[PDB]
């Protein structure tokens, strides 16, 4: 029978960090549907609105088996006298499970499926794909801010914000004879590099190298949380006009955004949790990014002509944060696709701006390091807001859930009978 598991949510977090806003434990065989409707607000910013932030709300299903593996299987089999499922440990702070959208129990411990569940959802859909998994054991092992506000999500695809995989080959040797090459061996050489290149660029995931075989893999083959629903939108608001002697001609942008998310009814195969997370981000607009062709001094035929034959046939080009940013070290490199500068265009911000707080732009220079300079650098948004004890953004939503089960009943459980 319909079980109304509705509840209110009073949220808040940083800019480019994934954070759990709601979770509902589900049992095997029940149908789950939710209607999440609220408003998203940003902290008051220092001037008028200039650029809308984009918001992504995700609802996933992670069965317990996925989390406890064989331990869970045995638990279900063993039944009533199964050994209790050991929760996970947390860090000394009421805001020490935040990322799990839950208050750490009185003993500072929490469900592993809440932890691993979360871990599994990031390492499978947010973490850059050449990147290493968050193999955190317990929330007491994750960085303070990773578990306060959540781990950093990736910046919105730019030219410099989506470099080619760093382990990307720029050459490939075939050991040849001293005065002869094997015309047939060469052929083969190319076949192998192909298979390698594909794995590097597109199939870094099993489920991915499979799909290109024309097959399919159940979220049960690779233990990946199942993405049930996804909502995306741009949050906006209005400016407030100051009207006293001193702040007459001054404004403060107020971002109030009504949003809604609908998770269509869903059949829960096994017992598990449904995680609903939010992520607020701004387009990667840096105040000092230059057009590659304008930042790289001598222009050769290969750079300026856009000869099809050329672009379509040479290795990825290794560039530095220096051919894209005005002061940046010659030393911080990344691999780009030849002619990439012709498939795109950076946003452009006049110098008059780079000295102004209140603009949701990237002031600072990138981060020499690949990873870090891709997964967004949240902190470079601290200067955009006024005062804030409600982080960068806060949310007030009413999670209207409806679960259809085969439950006892309230009176038949308390009725020894």
């Amino acid at each position: 029978v319909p079980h109304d598991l509705s509840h209110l949510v009073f949220e808040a977090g940083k800019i480019g960090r994934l954070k759990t806003i709601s979770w509902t434990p589900v049992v095997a065989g029940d149908s789950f549907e939710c209607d999440m409707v609220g408003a998203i607000r940003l902290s008051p910013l220092r001037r008028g609105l200039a650029v809308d932030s984009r918001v992504d709300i995700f609802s996933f299903y992670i069965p317990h088996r996925h989390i406890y593996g064989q331990q869970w299987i045995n638990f279900m089999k063993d039944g009533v006298n199964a050994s209790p499922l050991p929760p996970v440990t947390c860090s000394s702070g009421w805001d020490s499970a935040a990322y799990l959208g839950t208050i750490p129990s009185s003993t500072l411990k929490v469900p592993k499926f809440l932890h691993q569940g979360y871990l599994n959802i990031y390492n499978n859909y947010f973490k850059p794909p050449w990147s290493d998994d968050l193999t955190y054991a317990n929330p007491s092992n994750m960085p303070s801010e990773d578990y306060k506000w959540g781990v950093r999500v990736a910046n919105l695809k730019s030219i410099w914000t989506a470099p080619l995989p760093p382990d990307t080959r720029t050459s490939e040797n075939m050991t040849t004879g001293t005065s002869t090459i094997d015309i047939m061996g060469l052929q083969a050489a190319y076949a192998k590099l192909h298979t390698e290149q594909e794995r590097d660029y597109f199939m870094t995931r099993y489920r991915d190298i499979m799909k290109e075989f024309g097959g399919h893999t159940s979220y049960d083959g690779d233990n990946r949380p199942l993405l049930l629903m996804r909502s995306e939108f741009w949050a906006s608001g209005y400016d407030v006009d100051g009207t006293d002697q001193s702040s007459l001609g001054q404004f403060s942008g107020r971002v109030q955004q009504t949003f809604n998310h609908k998770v269509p009814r869903f059949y829960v195969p096994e017992h598990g949790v449904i995680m609903t997370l939010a992520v607020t981000r701004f387009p990667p607009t840096h105040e000092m990014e230059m057009h590659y062709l304008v930042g790289k001094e001598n222009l050769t035929y290969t750079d300026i002509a856009c000869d099809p034959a050329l672009m379509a046939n040479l290795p990825p080009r290794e560039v530095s944060l220096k051919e894209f940013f005005h002061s940046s070290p010659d030393s911080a490199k990344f691999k780009i696709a030849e002619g990439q500068w012709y498939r795109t265009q950076p946003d452009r911000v006049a110098f008059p701006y780079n000295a102004l707080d209140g603009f949701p732009f990237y002031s600072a220079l990138p981060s020499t390091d690949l990873k870090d300079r891709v997964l967004v650098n949240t902190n470079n948004y601290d200067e955009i807001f006024q005062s804030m004890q409600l982080a960068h953004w806060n949310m007030q939503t009413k999670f209207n859930i409806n679960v259809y089960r085969h439950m006892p009943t309230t009176r038949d459980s308390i009725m020894t009978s």
Partner: peptide
């Protein structure tokens, strides 16, 4: 138009 960004899969 056609794809551009290639990380080695899907990045949200």
């Amino acid at each position: 138009g056609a794809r551009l960004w290639y990380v080695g899969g899907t990045q949200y």
